[PDB]
């Protein structure tokens, strides 16, 4: 049927939790390598470039 429960709702604080855990893992080079990203020559992992 079409009225199967397709969508799900997650607590807003749990959504915000996951984004904090996602960003915080983007600063660990061992976790980004393990994701397969070829980043062995990036100067610094939390890569920041000027607003230009």
């Amino acid at each position: 049927k079409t009225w199967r429960r397709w969508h799900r709702r997650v607590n807003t604080t749990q959504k915000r939790y996951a984004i904090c855990s996602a960003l915080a893992a983007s600063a660990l080079p061992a976790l980004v390598m393990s994701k397969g990203h070829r980043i062995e020559e990036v100067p610094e992992l939390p890569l920041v470039v000027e607003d230009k």
Binding site: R8, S26, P43, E44, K52
Partner: protein
């Protein structure tokens, strides 16, 4: 973390600019793969289109 490091900003041509930014606090939040996974597999159902 007790002390947060000082991330360096890079110019558009690769070399390190003089400007530095303090590493934001969010990058020290707890890493929760079970939460990131739970939020992902539930929020990813919300873009589904019904079939019957």
């Amino acid at each position: 973390a007790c002390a947060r490091p000082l991330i360096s900003v890079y110019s558009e041509k690769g070399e390190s600019s003089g400007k530095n930014v303090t590493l934001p606090a969010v990058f020290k939040a707890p890493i929760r793969p079970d939460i990131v996974n739970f939020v992902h597999t539930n929020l990813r159902k919300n873009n589904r289109q019904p079939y019957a």
